[PDB]
Amino acid sequence: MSKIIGIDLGTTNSCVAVLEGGEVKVIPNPEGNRTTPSVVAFKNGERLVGEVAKRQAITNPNTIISIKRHMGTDYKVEIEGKQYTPQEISAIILQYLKSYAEDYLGEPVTRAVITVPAYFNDAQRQATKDAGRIAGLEVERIINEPTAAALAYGLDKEEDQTILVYDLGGGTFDVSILELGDGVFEVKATAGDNHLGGDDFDQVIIDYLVNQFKQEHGIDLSKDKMALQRLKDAAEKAKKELSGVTQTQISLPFISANENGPLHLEMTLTRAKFEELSAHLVERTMGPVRQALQDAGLTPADIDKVILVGGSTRIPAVQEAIKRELGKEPHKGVNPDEVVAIGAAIQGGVIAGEVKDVVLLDVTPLSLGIETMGGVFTKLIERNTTIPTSKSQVFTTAADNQTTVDIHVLQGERPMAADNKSLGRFQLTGIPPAPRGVPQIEVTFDIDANGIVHVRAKDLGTNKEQSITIKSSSGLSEEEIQRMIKEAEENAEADRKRKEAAELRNEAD
Template sequence: METQRQATLNAARQAGFRNVSLLNEPTAAAIAYGGVIDQQCTVMVFDFGGGTLDITIMKVEGREEYRMLTTDGNMYLGGEDFDNEIVQYFLEDIEKKTGHNLSEDNKARALLKLVAEQAKIALSNDIPRYHETVYSLEALFGIQYEAELTKETFQGMFQGLLKKILEPVKGALEATQLTVKDIDRVILVGGSSKLPAVKSTLEKFFGRSNVVCADANPDEAIAHGAAIQSYRLNNGQPSNFQEVTAYPYGIEVLHRNWLWRTTRIAELIPRGQPYPYKTTECFETAYDNQTAVTFQIYQSKRGFHVDKFRIGLFTIPNLPKRMKGECQFELTYDIDRNNILHATTQGRNNIADYKKNLDIQLDNIA
């Protein structure tokens, strides 16, 4: 996200770092796996964390060239969803065995979530059955409950979630017009990717057991890759990255027809656009004697016709007073090498001497 990247830059500068260069997490992961993947191959980075799933397809050419082709994902799917499935199983089991319905009790859910996380870790290894007496439930609610979960039940309760993790995988393949046979390696990143059910689901989908690569520690792969790249930069070793935008950029503009005025989102920078990138669009004032124009900036997960979320705004100030439509100006949007958006404006025709660098005010940044 734009706000997260800018916040990262701000934090690095406040900490005293100079010449900060942001590295996308999928690229860092690919660098970390550089010793075990072929020097020329097509890689899918499967980054499955506690709350989100990110899919990236990239071309690797040697040890120094990484070209991102597309990104996809689900911002609302992660390991926590698997924990919640286990919690729901325990709640239903408690009601069945004791007659107590604790589904609306936040304390009970919090206690069971800790048990669920422990069960998930245990059953993800070679333990066939998880069993624990939940003494905290007895202390708080007077309920004697022994949490039991077999590996078979554990693996069976995630079928719906496992289908969901394949949706962005298919979306990324469609966006690049690739097939499963074109993917040489699937790199696992993030703690939730360590679930055996996740790995086996990917192996079944790609039809090859050796395509899924988990040689590096999924919890440390991104940090490991960033450290390697930092070493390369400090030692003058060349590297070539071509990264792309994960989400499109758009601004809200006025749309007029002969009956009424409405607003719409004008897409300026598409999803999957390689950067650095610059584009220019022309606009005009909508009212007589209008001296300022404020544009709200949006991004979208699935296309502006489906959803949108605002990331910030900027204002073009001190425009000369003219009749509506007579004050025309160009807006130039520039994404730098760190995937940070910048904007400038230049007047046209009778206000050609008007030129400003615009201050983009991002949301949710202190």
């Protein structure tokens, strides 16, 4: 009985969420990076997948890169002579997602929910699903990412209404629109171009730079892969940075050099120069959005609201440039790069939360005990307990050198011996001339399945076992219980009992 793990199976990289608590978190893969890149290559006949994959990609020409474009089609791929199918590939990817999720729980996992894009089909769908079982993950369900990323805000519990999700993947871009009818999603329109993404920004930065450099000092940087990389990265960090701040400085000193020696790439860059410099990605975007808008028969004001996804989506100009051509403020705070995986896990949590039925056992409807010494009632088994159980307790000599000990085993609530119902009254002899003090006696009450109650009475050191069994006969549970408890409520001030507690008086020997 494993949880139901949510997974987001993406083109660029894929992500895996689960819920435990009223709380749902995103399992990290063995390395850093809550988010795992989806890819795999084989070397040893042993698979490698996820980032440690991208690392050696350029050794073994056998590296499968975004497969998820090929699922649901006849396609196969040769690896050192042998052919594979997407579902098999994406499958091994999954074998990782599940695997390391198991690592994280120590709790093997099976049940799962996996997500695929809005535009996918029946074929493709049975291809991911297929892949899933293939990895060994029984699917509980398969559902379409934007819906899944509607469980960020989980609007199914809201007003029937039409809503746009705008997803900018890492290397993709897609847009979707769904009227939520009868509480669910009639996914009304799909759209959006398949080469787009952050890197399609990171790039324009990289371009602007290198061109600016060759410009002033005259070399084309794309040549040496060293400073190529340095550049790439630089630009990227610069991207994330300009996510929130209005300026930044890049250095890349010692980058390359002329005959006056070392050449230091420095600079300061704006928000705007990049905004405008990105302005093309900017305006090329929306076409899919609008085309979709009529594509369902809907007016720009026909939406209720507009989600977001696609961690690159946290951008000044995307955002600024959206809601304005649109309805209200884009929905926030759900951390996009996982937003989808979050949705998965949610719906999974729900899939486990199915069974609402109820049942019997039995509560021992009235709390049992023995008259204790001093003439009080002392429970050995609190009221609503369970199928047969056992309790054991001790108690000791009444007054100096007792030879014999009664046991009155009574059923009730109230503190006061006689103030309840009673039952068989047995005793134990064989007790020796031991003064009041520590002559201890273990007395237990067994219970067995149907309401039968044994009882034991035993001295410790002399091992004397005399004991009874109650037949559950005399005790009345029809009304009589649901009465004499409320008695305990009416009369609860019966705590007056402590009188005899105080009667500890005659304990003066």
